[PDB]
Amino acid sequence: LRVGNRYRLGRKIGSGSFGDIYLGTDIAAGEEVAIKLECVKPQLHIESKIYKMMQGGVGIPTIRWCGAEGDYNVMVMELLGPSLEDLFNFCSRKFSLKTVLLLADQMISRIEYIHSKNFIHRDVKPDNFLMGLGKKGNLVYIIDFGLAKKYRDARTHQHIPYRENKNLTGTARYASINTHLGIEQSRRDDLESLGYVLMYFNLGSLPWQGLKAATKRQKYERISEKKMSTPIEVLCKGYPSEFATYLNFCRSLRFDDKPDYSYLRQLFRNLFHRQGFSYDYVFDWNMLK
Numbered sequence: 001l002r003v004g005n006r007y008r009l010g011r012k013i014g015s016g017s018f019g020d021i022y023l024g025t026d027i028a029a030g031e032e033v034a035i036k037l038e039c040v041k042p043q044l045h046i047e048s049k050i051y052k053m054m055q056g057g058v059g060i061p062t063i064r065w066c067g068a069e070g071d072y073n074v075m076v077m078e079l080l081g082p083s084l085e086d087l088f089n090f091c092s093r094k095f096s097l098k099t100v101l102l103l104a105d106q107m108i109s110r111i112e113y114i115h116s117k118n119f120i121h122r123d124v125k126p127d128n129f130l131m132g133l134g135k136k137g138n139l140v141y142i143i144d145f146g147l148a149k150k151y152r153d154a155r156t157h158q159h160i161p162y163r164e165n166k167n168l169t170g171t172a173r174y175a176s177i178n179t180h181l182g183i184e185q186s187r188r189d190d191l192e193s194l195g196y197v198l199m200y201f202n203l204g205s206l207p208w209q210g211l212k213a214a215t216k217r218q219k220y221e222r223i224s225e226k227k228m229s230t231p232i233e234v235l236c237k238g239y240p241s242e243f244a245t246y247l248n249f250c251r252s253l254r255f256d257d258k259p260d261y262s263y264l265r266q267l268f269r270n271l272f273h274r275q276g277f278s279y280d281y282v283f284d285w286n287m288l289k
Ligand SMILES: Nc1ncnc2c1c(COc1cccc(Cl)c1)nn2C1CCOCC1
Pocket: 013, 014, 015, 016, 021, 034, 035, 036, 044, 047, 061, 075, 076, 077, 078, 079, 080, 081, 143
């Protein structure tokens, strides 16, 4: 089907927060793009806005067209590549310390960027980080803002109030410990989750992973119990102390606190330089023959 006048809808690729993604072609421009279709019978437009607000940031997919099409709502964005999870599998589930640091530098910046635009992601995990293709193939992109919400006012930089008794709201494997306590989620939570993702890449899997549970409720309860019984020092044993520093710093932040993104990045950059690596964007998978 021909959509938005210049786009050609192709076969389905996968799916987003609440909608199905297709590989399409910007016929006039000759570029592959990704197209999400949302029944006029709702999240596309809520995202389009959060997406056109993030416009311009590195690692933020571009929105090329937004419109109605007969019985569908249409959004077109640049076609991105494999998620970090797909690539991790592709590398026999092993990432060198250099790949982990290269990703960490970019990932921390992405989260900083979003927070500067008054939003907190709330669902930071490996599948929501994809590399770019072609000219953007060396860049880590972040997706799925279905759970993203404003945490502070544009003008009075007034921070959302503090509140507890809230149900879990993302993946429980990478959720921050306070998310598990019903505490409202803020900037510190996005960074803590990124933190688990990093150790997740170094270990191959987290200690609260693959637990044994008869019911769904008991599995979530076990994950939370385990993530609270595992000290950061035990989680990070055998790996550069910097990963532990990052995690303790995150967990320590105060609800409305502003993270020191620079310190966190430098934490890793100093280690990176001590190891003698260069920020050459040469990841493990780039070495696959
Ligand atoms: N841009 C993309 N390029 C390549 N792959 C992509 C995406 C998106 C988001 O695409 C849109 C398009 C229009 C609107 C919105 Cl919200 C999201 N998701 N995926 C994958 C689909 C399969 O499942 C895992 C993720």
